[PDB]
Design a protein around this ligand. Structure first.
Ligand SMILES: COc1cccc(C2=NC(=O)C(O)=CC2)c1
Ligand SMILES: [Mn+2]
Ligand SMILES: [Mn+2]
Ligand SMILES: [Mn+2]
Length: 200
């Protein structure tokens, strides 16, 4: 079939909020979304996974973790996760440092992606086009804070997480895996997938 452009794919398949946050982060780090196009799509994918991991997860009046998929959560409900990724570096560290001084959790070396108020830990999310164990070790070796929990998703449905602790229920992780499958299938229909996979 015809080869599409990754630019077109990104603009058509991701929410404009995600796209804009991704462009901003690439510029903050000196990379151009119109040149590092596979990376642009990967950043959008990862940021969407971070949002989707957080989506619908609250802590209720009693203090228990619950899932609320309707648009209207009860007003006493608190988001279960803090989202770090997507913020610029000053704001991301502002949020991190705050969590740390409050909850007593130590400060990590690098910016993580989320904070889980139920499990009381930072989370690093990984999304990979390669074997999950390989990518797991890369992230583990990089941060080595050893309090930050790591959760890796691949595009073919495999997952790996610290201490075989997957944090979320099967249905939540299934939403993420379905979305990843969709991204891959659509990239493939546009003849973008092989290259995107190989560029990681
Ligand atoms: C300019 O490059 C950027 C910009 C913003 C995010 C990220 C990533 N963050 C991750 O947590 C992650 O796991 C992969 C990539 C990379
Ligand atoms: Mn970031
Ligand atoms: Mn991150
Ligand atoms: Mn990450």
């Amino acid at each position: 079939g015809p080869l599409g452009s990754m630019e077109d794919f990104v603009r058509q398949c991701f929410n404009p909020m995600i796209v804009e946050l991704a462009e901003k982060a690439m510029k903050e780090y000196g990379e151009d979304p119109k040149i590092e196009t596979n990376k642009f799509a990967a950043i959008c994918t990862h940021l969407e996974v971070c949002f989707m991991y957080s989506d619908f997860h609250f802590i209720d009046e009693r203090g228990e973790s619950i899932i609320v998929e309707s648009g209207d959560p009860n007003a006493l409900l608190k988001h279960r996760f803090e989202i770090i990724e997507g913020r610029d570096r000053i704001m991301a560290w502002t949020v991190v440092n705050s969590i740390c001084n409050t909850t007593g959790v130590e400060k990590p070396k690098f910016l993580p992606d989320l904070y889980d108020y139920k499990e009381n830990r930072f989370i690093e999310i990984g999304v990979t086009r390669r074997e999950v164990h390989i990518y797991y070790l890369e992230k583990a070796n990089k941060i080595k804070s050893e309090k930050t929990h790591i959760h890796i998703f691949s595009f073919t449905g495999e997952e790996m997480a610290t201490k075989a602790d997957y944090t979320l229920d099967e249905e939540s992780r299934a939403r993420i895996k379905t979305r990843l499958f969709t991204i891959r299938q659509e990239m493939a229909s546009r003849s973008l997938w092989d290259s995107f996979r190989q560029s990681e």
